[PDB]
Amino acid sequence: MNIFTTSILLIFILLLSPILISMSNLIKHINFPLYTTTSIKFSFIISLLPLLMFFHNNMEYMITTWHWVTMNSMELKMSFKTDFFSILFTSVALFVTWSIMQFSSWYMHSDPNINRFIKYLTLFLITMLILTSANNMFQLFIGWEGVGIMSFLLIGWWYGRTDANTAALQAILYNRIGDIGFILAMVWFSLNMNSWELQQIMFSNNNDNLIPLMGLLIAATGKSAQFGLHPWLPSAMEGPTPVSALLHSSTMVVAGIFLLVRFHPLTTNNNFILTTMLCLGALTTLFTAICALTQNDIKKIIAFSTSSQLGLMMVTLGMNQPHLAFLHICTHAFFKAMLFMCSGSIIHSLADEQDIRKMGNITKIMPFTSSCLVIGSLALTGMPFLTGFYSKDLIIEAINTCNTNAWALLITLIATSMTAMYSMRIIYFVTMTKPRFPPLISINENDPDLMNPIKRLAFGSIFAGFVISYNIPPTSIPVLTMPWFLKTTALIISVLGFLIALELNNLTMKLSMNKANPYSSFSTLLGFFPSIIHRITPMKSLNLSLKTSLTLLDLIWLEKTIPKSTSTLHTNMTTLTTNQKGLIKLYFMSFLINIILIIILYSINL
Amino acid sequence: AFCAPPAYLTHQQKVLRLYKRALRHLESWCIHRDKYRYFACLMRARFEEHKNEKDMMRATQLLREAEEEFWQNQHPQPYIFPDSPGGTSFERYECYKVPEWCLDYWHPSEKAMYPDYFSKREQWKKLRMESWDREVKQLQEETSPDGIMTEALPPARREGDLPPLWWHIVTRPRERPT
Amino acid sequence: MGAHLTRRYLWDASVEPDPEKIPSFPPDLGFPERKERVMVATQQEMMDAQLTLQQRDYCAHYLIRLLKCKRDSFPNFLACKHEQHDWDYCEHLDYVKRMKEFERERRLLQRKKRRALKEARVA
Amino acid sequence: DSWDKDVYPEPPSRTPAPSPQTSLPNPITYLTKAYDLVVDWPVTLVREFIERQHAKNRTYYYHRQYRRVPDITECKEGDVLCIYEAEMQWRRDFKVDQEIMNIIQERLKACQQREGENYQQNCAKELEQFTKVTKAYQDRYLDLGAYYSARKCLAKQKQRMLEERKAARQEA
Amino acid sequence: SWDVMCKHLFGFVAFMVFMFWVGHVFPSYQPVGPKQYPYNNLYLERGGDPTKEPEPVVHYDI
Amino acid sequence: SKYKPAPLATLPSTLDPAEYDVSPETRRAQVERLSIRARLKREYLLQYNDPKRVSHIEDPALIRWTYARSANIYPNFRPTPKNSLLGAVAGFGPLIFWYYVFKTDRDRKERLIQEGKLDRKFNISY
Amino acid sequence: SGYTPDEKLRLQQLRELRRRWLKDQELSPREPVLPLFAVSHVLIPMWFVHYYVKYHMATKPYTIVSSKPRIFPGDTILETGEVIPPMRDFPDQHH
Ligand SMILES: CCCCCCCCCCCCCCCCCC(=O)OC[C@H](COP(=O)(O)OCCN)OC(=O)CCCCCCCCCCCCCCCCC
Ligand SMILES: CCCCCCCCCCCCCCCCCC(=O)OC[C@H](COP(=O)(O)OCCN)OC(=O)CCCCCCCCCCCCCCCCC
Numbered sequence A: 001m002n003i004f005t006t007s008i009l010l011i012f013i014l015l016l017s018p019i020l021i022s023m024s025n026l027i028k029h030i031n032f033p034l035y036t037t038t039s040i041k042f043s044f045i046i047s048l049l050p051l052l053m054f055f056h057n058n059m060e061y062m063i064t065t066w067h068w069v070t071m072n073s074m075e076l077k078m079s080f081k082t083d084f085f086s087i088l089f090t091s092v093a094l095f096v097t098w099s100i101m102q103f104s105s106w107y108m109h110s111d112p113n114i115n116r117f118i119k120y121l122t123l124f125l126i127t128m129l130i131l132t133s134a135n136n137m138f139q140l141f142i143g144w145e146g147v148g149i150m151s152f153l154l155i156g157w158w159y160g161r162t163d164a165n166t167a168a169l170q171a172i173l174y175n176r177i178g179d180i181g182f183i184l185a186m187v188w189f190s191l192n193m194n195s196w197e198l199q200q201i202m203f204s205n206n207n208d209n210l211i212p213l214m215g216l217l218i219a220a221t222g223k224s225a226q227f228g229l230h231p232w233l234p235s236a237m238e239g240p241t242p243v244s245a246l247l248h249s250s251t252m253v254v255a256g257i258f259l260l261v262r263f264h265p266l267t268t269n270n271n272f273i274l275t276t277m278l279c280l281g282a283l284t285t286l287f288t289a290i291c292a293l294t295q296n297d298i299k300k301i302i303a304f305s306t307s308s309q310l311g312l313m314m315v316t317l318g319m320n321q322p323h324l325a326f327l328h329i330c331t332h333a334f335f336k337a338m339l340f341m342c343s344g345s346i347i348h349s350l351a352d353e354q355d356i357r358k359m360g361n362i363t364k365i366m367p368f369t370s371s372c373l374v375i376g377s378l379a380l381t382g383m384p385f386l387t388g389f390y391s392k393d394l395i396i397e398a399i400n401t402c403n404t405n406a407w408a409l410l411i412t413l414i415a416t417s418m419t420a421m422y423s424m425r426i427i428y429f430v431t432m433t434k435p436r437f438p439p440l441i442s443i444n445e446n447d448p449d450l451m452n453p454i455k456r457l458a459f460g461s462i463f464a465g466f467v468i469s470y471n472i473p474p475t476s477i478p479v480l481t482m483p484w485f486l487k488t489t490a491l492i493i494s495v496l497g498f499l500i501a502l503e504l505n506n507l508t509m510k511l512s513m514n515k516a517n518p519y520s521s522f523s524t525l526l527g528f529f530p531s532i533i534h535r536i537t538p539m540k541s542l543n544l545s546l547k548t549s550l551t552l553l554d555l556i557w558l559e560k561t562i563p564k565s566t567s568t569l570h571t572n573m574t575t576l577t578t579n580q581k582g583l584i585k586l587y588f589m590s591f592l593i594n595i596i597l598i599i600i601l602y603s604i605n606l
Numbered sequence B: 001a002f003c004a005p006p007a008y009l010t011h012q013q014k015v016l017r018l019y020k021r022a023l024r025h026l027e028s029w030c031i032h033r034d035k036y037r038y039f040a041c042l043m044r045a046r047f048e049e050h051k052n053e054k055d056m057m058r059a060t061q062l063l064r065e066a067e068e069e070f071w072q073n074q075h076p077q078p079y080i081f082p083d084s085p086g087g088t089s090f091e092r093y094e095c096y097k098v099p100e101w102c103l104d105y106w107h108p109s110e111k112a113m114y115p116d117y118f119s120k121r122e123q124w125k126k127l128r129m130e131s132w133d134r135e136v137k138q139l140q141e142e143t144s145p146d147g148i149m150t151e152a153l154p155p156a157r158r159e160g161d162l163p164p165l166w167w168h169i170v171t172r173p174r175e176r177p178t
Numbered sequence C: 001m002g003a004h005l006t007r008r009y010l011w012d013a014s015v016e017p018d019p020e021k022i023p024s025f026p027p028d029l030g031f032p033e034r035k036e037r038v039m040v041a042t043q044q045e046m047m048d049a050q051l052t053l054q055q056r057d058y059c060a061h062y063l064i065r066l067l068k069c070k071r072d073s074f075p076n077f078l079a080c081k082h083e084q085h086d087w088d089y090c091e092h093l094d095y096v097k098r099m100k101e102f103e104r105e106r107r108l109l110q111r112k113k114r115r116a117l118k119e120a121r122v123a
Numbered sequence D: 001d002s003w004d005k006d007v008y009p010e011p012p013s014r015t016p017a018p019s020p021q022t023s024l025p026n027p028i029t030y031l032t033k034a035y036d037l038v039v040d041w042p043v044t045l046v047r048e049f050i051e052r053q054h055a056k057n058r059t060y061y062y063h064r065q066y067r068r069v070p071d072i073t074e075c076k077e078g079d080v081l082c083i084y085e086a087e088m089q090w091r092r093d094f095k096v097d098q099e100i101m102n103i104i105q106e107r108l109k110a111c112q113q114r115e116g117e118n119y120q121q122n123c124a125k126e127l128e129q130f131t132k133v134t135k136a137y138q139d140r141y142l143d144l145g146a147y148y149s150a151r152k153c154l155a156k157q158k159q160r161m162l163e164e165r166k167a168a169r170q171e172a
Numbered sequence E: 001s002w003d004v005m006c007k008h009l010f011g012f013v014a015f016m017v018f019m020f021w022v023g024h025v026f027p028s029y030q031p032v033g034p035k036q037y038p039y040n041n042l043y044l045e046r047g048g049d050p051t052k053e054p055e056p057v058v059h060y061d062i
Numbered sequence F: 001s002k003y004k005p006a007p008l009a010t011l012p013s014t015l016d017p018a019e020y021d022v023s024p025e026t027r028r029a030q031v032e033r034l035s036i037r038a039r040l041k042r043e044y045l046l047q048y049n050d051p052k053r054v055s056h057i058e059d060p061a062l063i064r065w066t067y068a069r070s071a072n073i074y075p076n077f078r079p080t081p082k083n084s085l086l087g088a089v090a091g092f093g094p095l096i097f098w099y100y101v102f103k104t105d106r107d108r109k110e111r112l113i114q115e116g117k118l119d120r121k122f123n124i125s126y
Numbered sequence G: 001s002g003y004t005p006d007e008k009l010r011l012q013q014l015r016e017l018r019r020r021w022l023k024d025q026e027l028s029p030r031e032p033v034l035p036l037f038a039v040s041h042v043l044i045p046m047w048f049v050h051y052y053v054k055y056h057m058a059t060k061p062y063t064i065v066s067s068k069p070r071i072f073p074g075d076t077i078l079e080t081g082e083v084i085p086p087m088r089d090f091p092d093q094h095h
Helices: A002-023 A032-057 A084-107 A114-132 A137-155 A162-190 A211-223 A232-238 A241-251 A254-262 A264-269 A271-294 A298-318 A322-349 A367-380 A387-401 A406-431 A448-471 A489-508 A518-524 A526-533 A537-578 A584-604 B011-016 B018-024 B034-048 B056-072 B115-141 C003-009 C043-048 C060-071 C082-119 D027-056 D080-110 D125-137 D150-171 E002-025 F024-044 F060-070 F093-097 F099-115 G010-025 G037-057
Strands: A061-069 A076-081 G064-066
Touching: A002 A032, A002 A061, A002 A076, A002 A084, A002 A114, A002 D027, A002 G037, A032 A084, A032 A114, A032 D027, A032 G037, A061 G037, A076 A137, A084 A114, A084 A241, A084 A254, A084 A322, A084 A448, A114 A137, A114 A241, A114 A254, A137 A162, A137 A232, A137 A241, A137 A254, A162 A211, A162 A232, A211 A254, A211 A264, A211 A271, A232 A241, A232 A298, A241 A254, A241 A298, A241 A322, A254 A264, A254 A298, A254 A322, A264 A271, A271 A298, A271 A406, A271 A518, A271 A526, A271 E002, A298 A322, A298 A387, A298 A406, A322 A367, A322 A387, A322 A406, A322 A448, A367 A387, A367 A406, A367 A448, A387 A406, A387 A448, A387 A489, A406 A489, A406 E002, A518 A526, A526 E002, B011 B018, B011 B056, B018 B034, B018 B056, B115 G010, C043 C060, C060 C082, D027 G037, D080 D125, D080 D150, F093 F099
Parallel strands: none
Antiparallel strands: A061 A076, A061 G064
16 A cells, blocks of 8 residues: 555655755745644654554555665665554654644744754654664664764753753763664674564574674663663753653653564563563662652653653563553653653743742642643553553553562562652642742743643643554453452552652651751762762773873883884994094904904805 | 952851851752741851850861861752753853854955944944053053952043953853843 | 462472472373363464464454454444453453462472371371 | 566465444545545656656667686686686676575565564575575685685685585595 | 762662562562463464474363 | 762862961962962953954963973883883783683684584675 | 952943943844745655655565455455355353
């Protein structure tokens, strides 16, 4: 059905159209923000047409558009897969993007370079979708590196600020450590089984496939902020709030989760790596969640929640439940996008206050965002019959029913209670409290560009879990049979998580000094992984270059040995041979010596 | 940022600058307001007492144990304002603060528009060159006898003279270029 | 999480089953001519319905039905509800089996411990 | 001339027939009815008009056929003329024997997209061939450096023809 | 203090890693026996050799 | 707990005994150093704020830094111990380490290929 | 402390000049002297794509491959005409 193929190729052409308009002189004459917002809107509708096809018939398509090099045995070609993962994600991503660009127009209003900002956002979407629908992994690499570079360009939008520059260099470094893993997996699949195309890599099921998948797991940990190198996604919040929503919140981070689902036919074979990520996903879930409890920056708390939810997503991939992991990716995108832009509304409406400490009683001052915030908060806490509930409790009870690390099982559940706690922290401090913001009040959220997108995503946050769960193809053969406390565990832990936190928030109001526990600061400064591993490594990696590798072995030792020594050896030799009295007697005698030696040279060799 | 740094700090400015860090690091612990305003007038009490200690030695022994009490009772994420060093918007808008000596290489076409703008800019540049002599001379004639020298610069002290080394405190790129 | 673990990990595991080897004893033990499981679907039917290998359970047959009523009835994704209950039931009625088998292996292992001691007549 | 159904095979198609069981109207059928009119017909019209423009001055292009010259196996030693003609004849077949392997790389890829969830089984007509062809490509062209030459394949083989003669003799 | 930091961070890391080990030793698994797949554990469909039949693996009721 | 400065996480200004000093000698330096800075400050501030200037303010303190760091090194090199022992462990140490890392691997690989164990399956490239 | 009487005049005066600079920065009137479409970029791009997908890709071998369609028990195969046998009867009715 060409309608299907053409549609998958068409979304890319339509989104690329804003990019070249800015290359020509035409954008000055038309409005770039409005034009870009409309075309993503049309791209979402175009994406819907294949989505219905798949659902009606559940069929996939590998599209080989252009050949790039034969390179002898390994031919390289540009291929877009249209498997359930690719088209489901393509639709969810553009809806979020359509929401954010309209938010972007309101948020960055008064920025002198709005058009460039919108331009990079769509370039990000083009790389993100290429990363999504990539058959051969070389294209997956183009997407993997591609979102990394544009994140660097967009985290540090305001280049002047060194803090933004530091975060951008952070993000590239963590991504590049991840890139080493993908290169290793690529190289292993460029040798052994031989083609970077997924359709053939999957014929490596009954092989070792550990050297390679360990590489992809390493790539995922860097891209998805698992416990190892978890800090750049918190650091990424130095970016503009809309950038934080579409890339820090949904498309960029889920890329690591998406890669492993693409390669899970191979993942099911190796038991060792499955528990490895189950284990690290589990550690990141709580580690990030505990850090979020004391963080006093609204954007920071949401970002930690982005990492904690993906930690749960990592856990399901680790328990070899790929389809549900993808289901959470889609539902995760709707609500996290909402909460960020919700805080975008609060931060912009207030005098750019990004701290929960000075922000209060937004519920009465701004009901529209507060309503959106609590809708999102409950979805994050898996309120029954909301989008989180359809996918999240499936994952929870999956854990409660599988054979798993006891430590992983316990931490994931309390991680769920903490998600309720920090969710409670945000609404109590941000919304339900006496106002503490600066005295002059100038709040307006009436702008259509704020409401509309927030309104549209809110509709998605309310109904998406209903629609996606029923429509997707039956998969995974879930276990609905459980003792009732395990069946209802997700619901109860979420309930008491808020209950306990509400007790905490309530406690503070008293005139009695509590401050915080000794491990509280440990929590507030991010587990101290940032304070220690960011000051030692960059210090003992640069000291060795300047002091040891550059100046010691370079410069002096490699210049005194080869280039300089040969300089000296000769210099000294000329000094002895050319220091001559000039007297004839001396010189002549030397002629005598010569005659003698030559007489002998003949004599002995007679 | 405007005034110049004093060489050594007095006892007072060290005490009175703790009253700021302290009270401001007490409003991170006391997220609410009534709790804060309470727990803080209790802070002043601490500083209010031991105000009239005349025994310097003692005073510098209350100060040195105050700033250690504080270091161990500080909040890791203090509430630092949005636009101040260490903040969230610090130097955000600096990507738009071009340094104003760049409008001098504009093409005669660009400067063709925006006409009255450059008519006033050429006046100010006449002001700058018209006083560099009287300024530097002032800066020098008033070089106090060689000795302690601080970064403080003199005012005008005569009509028509422009308070010196002024071209970059005035003509500063605007804070929010937006 | 559960008590079963406590039995095995706390206390003694002698009589607690090892999940890795659930049918640890003779399959026929305890049953004269026990009937083996039966599959309604056809090795081909499944292969033509492209059921994921994992989903090829003894409930594969009620699944194919669901999938049928999900392709048919396309615009309406909320109407193949009876079919899902059925599949699920089939599976609940399978999970229970897998639970009955585990309990049976538990008890049988106990038989061994009882019998050993009984059979361990002093003299 | 799009493709030789036999060099790039393709299985016959079996499609379940439409069997709607809902009163609601399928949102796909309506759209297609449009695509077919506002997207296909317009294009279809142009395309034809292309091909008739082509068929007026229809031209042809052939496929050079290379006569087979003598192979290094038979080629004087030091005679740079003969060996040059014979290292090319091989470097040429180093490629013809490489696009063949490109096709098995491809024919398979399709047979695992066309048979998902069954690839483990239905698609084993080709993976048996991907080893019947890979075990051969490995046995004539693999150890060789980047300076692959017919003299070296002649030796890579003949180092092993000892083995298919020492091992055989050994079995005795 | 820096030491306090280095010790605490790594302590956490170690305790966690360890507890995860206590976990692998004592896992959590429901009272459910093994799942039963039809045919010979899908021998042929798991891509098994069509010609060589496998030792039948049978699963009985209850 | 007393804060404990490490080479990193150094002792803050407060909590630093030296800060709490009024010995007239100390104050003497603290007021002498501002002078050097004030002097240097009033040598940057009326040369950068000078109309009629096009030449490049030089910042010779940066030129003394680069010369000290790339062109005043070898003229101040004296080969001692702790410098040549450490100047050979750095150039030949890992360079010899990896050789026995790569030789052993390459030799393991070769043996296995020779004996017939390495699979080299579906590897048609190299 | 308190500003020094000679610094509350270098801030007195320089602030006065900054106020004039910012006034001068103000633009005079005229200062800037300068001297459905939806279908357009959805339909025009589309025709092209289709031209490309139905007359290059489709034509070339193995360029658009699709998972086999799903065939269930009792549903007819249009191309060949066969009717997939109905499956063995489900004996249980237990809900
Ligand atoms: C040659 C030796 C080295 C010499 C170096 C210096 C040479 C300078 C002077 C000569 C310049 C011209 C000669 C070199 C360029 C040759 C261009 C060319 O060969 O185009 C071929 C291309 C068709 O491609 P073809 O390979 O025939 O088809 C694939 C078949 N399987 O035809 C085309 O597609 C033309 C397309 C034009 C516009 C293409 C833009 C594509 C951009 C894609 C990349 C975008 C992202 C790039 C990221 C880069 C990051 C740094
Ligand atoms: C920075 C990221 C580091 C990532 C490291 C990932 C390591 C993965 C596991 C590699 C080591 C085990 C490989 C196991 C393969 C199968 C078993 C085997 O036989 O090894 C292959 C071969 C022989 O190794 P082995 O069995 O130990 O025999 C030694 C005999 N004397 O192996 C050999 O050829 C001998 C050497 C084996 C061990 C090599 C260790 C390499 C260490 C790399 C350090 C990287 C950092 C260097 C400094 C960077 C900063 C300056």
